[model samples]
Target: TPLVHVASVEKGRSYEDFQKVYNAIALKLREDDEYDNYIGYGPVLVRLAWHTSGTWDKHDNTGGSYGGTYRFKKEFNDPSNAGLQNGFKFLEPIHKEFPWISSGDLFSLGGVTAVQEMQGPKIPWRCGRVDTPEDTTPDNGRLPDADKDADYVRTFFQRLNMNDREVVALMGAHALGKTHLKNSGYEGPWGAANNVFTNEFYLNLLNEDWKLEKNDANNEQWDSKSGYMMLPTDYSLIQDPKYLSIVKEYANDQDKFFKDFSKAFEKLLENGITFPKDAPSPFIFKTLEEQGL
Candidate 1:
C-alpha cells in the first residue's frame, strides 16, 4: 500500500490566527492559578519545553520537541525531567481543549506562551512536528548535569547544536525558576522574584557575593543568604572568560538580554530544520491582555 500524506494546517492561517491560539492558551494559564503559588507555572513551562527539545541530538535527530512523546509514562519518568511533571500537568487541560493540536505543537506553544506572558520577547513557533511512539524517546543522560563544570557544560550543549553565546543566553533562563531538592537533586531559588522573567540571573551573577556552600538538602551549590543560589553549571558562565562578556552584557541591559534570549530560544526549538528566506517572518504571539479576550 502506498503511504498517504498528512496535510498541515492551512497556510492561509496568518500570525493573527496563531495569536488567537496563543491567547487561548494564555487565558487557560491564568485561570489555573494554584500551581506554584500562581507563580504562573510559566517559567518552568518554558524549561519543560527546553528540556523536551534539548534532548534532540543533531547527529541522528532521534529526540526533539518535534516528537512530543513526553506524554508517555516513560518520557515523564525520565530522571532528568523529574521536576517537569508540574509543567506537563499544567498543560493537560490545554491539550484536552485543543485536541486537534499535536503534542509537539502544544509543548512548543506552551514555551512560546510562557515567554511572552512573562514579559520576555516574543518567540515565533511553527507546527509541522508530529507525535511519536515511546521507543523514539532519547536515552537518559543527554541533559546537562547540574554538578558539572565549564568543559562539561560546553560539550553537553554541543550535542544540542548550541554555540557558546547561545549556551550563555539559554542559561539566562535560570533567571526564572528555582531548583528543588527533590528535583534535579539541587535546591533553592536563583533570584528574588523567581517567577518574573528578567536579567536578574545575570545581575545576581555579577553582583552577588556568592559563597560555595551545601544547602540544607545537602546539595553543593553557590549560595548567598540573599536566598539566591546558582548551580555549578549556572555559575560556570561567569567562571569561563569566554561566556563572561555575554553574561555581563545581559546583566547590564535588560533589552539586549531579552533580544538575545528570544533568538537563542527560537533556535533551540527549531533544531535541525532549514527555513528559506521566504518562510514567514517570525510571529510575535500576543499575551492574554494584548488580545483583550
Candidate 2:
C-alpha cells in the first residue's frame, strides 16, 4: 500500500483537458450503440463501479475497486452484482484500447466519467491503483440487500464509512437507474426516463401514492407501475421520518442533489484510501455535447 506519485502531466491541462478523455470515452459509448439497446450503458456502468467498490469494509481492506476482480467470473457472478456484466462487457473494448490503464483505474474512472457525463459533478480521481490478480478477488455478500430495513441500511453503509447524509445522497442515484428482475431479481424502473440524471427518484418517493405489491416476478417492491418502482429498502427512506426531509430536499432541487451526490459518491469510490490535498484536483470531465462531438 505504499504510495508512489506518477509524474504530473502537463500543468497546462485543465478541466477542459480531462474533458477530452471524457469525449473519447463518451464517443465510444455512443458508437457501441447495441449494448443495453444503446441506453448507453453509462448509468449502470456507474452503478457497476459503485457496487464493485461498495463492498469494501473500512475496518479491513477486504473489498474495494482496487482489486478490479470483475474480470474474474466469481466476482462477475456475485449475487449482489447480478446485472453488472453489461457494464463490464461495455468496458472491455475501452480496456483493450487503453491497455496501460489499470482495471482499478478503468472501473473507477468509468464511474467518474459516467457521473460527469450525466451532468453530476467533478470527482477528483488519483491513479495509483494497480490491478490485482484473480486470486485477490474479495469474497461475496458485501453489498446491502434491497429487502432490508433502515437499520440494516445504516449498518451496511458504515462498513464503507458512509454516514446518514451520505447514504441519502447516494441513494439519490436510484433516480437514474432501476432493478431488472433478470438482473437483481427485482423489477421495473425507479423513475420515468431511467436513463436521464435527475432528482425524480426523491420526488417520486415523497409524492407518489405507493401501493405495496409483488411484481409479476414476485419481489415485494412498492410499485406505482406508472413506470416507477421502489425497492423495500428504498421505500424505507420515507418510512423513517429522519431520512425523509433530505429526500424531499433532493426531490425539489436538482442542484442540491447533484452537490450532495458528488461529495458522497466521491467518498464512496475513495473508501479505504488516504489521500493528501496536494494529491490532485478532482477531474470534471465534459459530456459529448460540451466537446462538440
Candidate 3:
C-alpha cells in the first residue's frame, strides 16, 4: 500500500491563524511593487506555489503539497525552478515571522494569497499540510514542459488527474507573469496586463496574430506584433480543437474562468493529502483591501 499523508493542523492554529498569514503575504505583495517592473512578486509567488505542488504524482502519492519538499536543495535546485529562488527569498521573512507554520502550508498559502490580492477569484484554502522529511521529496522532472504541444500537455496532466478543462483553467494563470529568457528560456508577457488576474491569456491566444519565432535562447515561441509572446505549449491550446473550445469559453466568460480556476488550482494544491472527515472546511481568506488595510 502507498504511504498516506494526512492533513495535520499546527498546534492551536485555526482559520484566524492562517488568515493572519494571508494578511502578511497580501500586504507584502502591495508594498513590494518594484519587483519585475512594478509587476510585484504576485506572479512569482503564484509560480512558486504551483511549482512546489506541481511535483505531485498521483500513482504513488510521492511528490505533492503534502511534503513541502521544495525546501530541500534537490527540489529547489531543479533546473526548471531557476527563477523561483526570488519567490523563495520573498517568503523567507514571512516564514521567520510565522515560524510555527508548516513549510507546505506557507508555500501553498502564498499562491492563494497572491491570487486573491491580484484580484483573482477567492480560492478556498485549507490548512494542515505538514512538512515531510527530505527523504520524501519527489525527484525533479515531474513538471510539464513549455515546448510541448497540446497532446503532450494532455498526457502530462493526466498523471495529476486533471482533465482538459482543468488544465486550460490552471494555464489561465499565464495572464499574470511574463516568461523571462534567462529563467525558462522563453520571453515576453502573455498579455498587456501582466500583474492583474484575467482571462486575457485565452483572449490573447484567440485574438492575437501570432507568428512562430525563435527567441535568443533558440527556443520556439509564438510572438505577437503587439509585443506579447506565448510558448509553443501555450499556442498549442488553439492547435488542438478540444483545448481550443475551452479557450474560447474562458475568453468569452470571465466569471466562469475565475470560478473554474479557483477549483482547479485548489485541487492542484491539495492533490496528495488525505483529510479526515472531521477536518475543517477550506478557509476563504479576505484580501487586504477587503479589510481596509
Candidate 4:
C-alpha cells in the first residue's frame, strides 16, 4: 500500500486542479520540439515516468512511484538512467508552475500527458504520490537491460507482479522511442514512425527481415533496411511463444493495443502504491484535441 492519501496531506485539489498542470505540460510539449532532431521530449518523458515507477518491489513496496525519490542523487545518477536528465529538465518549467504537485505525481502525469497527447489511449490517472527522503531510493540494476533474453525479462517483471500479457503490452512502448548510442549503447528506432504511438513495433517485428548486426559500440541489435531496430530484449517477445501470441494480437488490433497498453501503462505507473478506501478513484484525462487545444 502507498504511504498516504492525497486528501489527507494535500487537501482540496481534484481533477480540475490536475487538469491545469496537464495543460501546462501539454503547452510546453507543443513549444518544445528541440530534442534529438525535433523528435521532441514525448518519448523521453514517458521513459522518465516508467523508469521512476519501474523501481517498485511488489513484496516490500520499498521502491515505487509513491516516493518520487528520483530527485535524489543516488537515483538521478543511476547509470541505467543516464539519459533521462533531458526528460527531467523538460518538466522543470511545468513543476515551477504547479508547485503544489508532488514530484511522483508530476513524473507519472508527464507520462500520461505524453501518451495521450501523442494520439494514444485515455490512461486513467490518479495523483496522491508524495516525495520521500534520499535513503528511500532503490539501488541500480533494478531496471531491465537491453542485452537480456526472454527468461530475464520474465523474471525481472515478476518483481513488479506483472505477467506475460502485461509485459508484452508494456513493451509496446518500444514503438515510441529510439535507443541512443550514448545512453544505452544501442541505436535506431523500433519502427519508422518513431514519434507516433502505435502498434508498429509489433507490426515491424513480424514483418521485417531482421539481420543481427553489431552497432558502432559493438552491441548486438537486430536491424533492417527500413531503419528499424530491435534490442535483444525486444526479440525475446517473439522467441517466447506466449509473448509472441499477444504481440500478434496487438499488432492486428489497434483498439486492443490501445486498451491493453493503457491498462498496462497505468498499472506500471501505479505499481507498489495502494489507494485509500475513501480516496478518489482513477481519472480518464481529456486529450488536448478533445479540449480544443
The best candidate by TM-score is 3
Counting only residues 3 or more apart in sequence or on different chains, how many pairs clash (N, Cα, C under 3 Å) in candidate 1? 0
- Model 3 Cα lDDT, one tens digit per residue, 141-222: 9888898899999999998999999999999999998999999899989999899999999989999899999999999899
Tell me the tens digit of each residue's lDDT in model 1 across 1-293: 32221325434566666666677778877777666665668878898899889888877766778778788877788898988998888788777766767787778888989888877887777765667778877777677778888999899999888889888888988888787788877887899877678889999999999999987777789988688899999889898998898889888889888888888898888785545555566666767767676
* Stretch of 10 with least lDDT, candidate 2: 2-11
**Local accuracy by lDDT, each model:** 0.80, 0.75, 0.93, 0.88
lDDT of model 3, residue 28: 86
* TM-score, cand. 3 vs. native: 0.99
Which residue runs does candidate 3 get wrong by more than 4 Å? none
lDDT of 2 at 121: 62
Deviation of model 3 at 213, angstroms: 0.5
The candidate, 3 or 4, that scores higher on lDDT is 3
Candidate order by decreasing TM-score: 3, 4, 1, 2
Candidate 3 colliding pairs? 56-63
How close to the true structure is residue 7 of candidate 4, measured as C-alpha lDDT? 26
Mark the regions of model 4 whose C-alpha exceeds 4 Å error after superposition: 1-9
Put down candidate 4 lDDT per residue, 142-184, tens digits, no spaces.
Answer: 8988898999999999999999999999999999979999998
What is the RMSD, in Å, between candidate 1 and the native fold over all Cα?
3.3
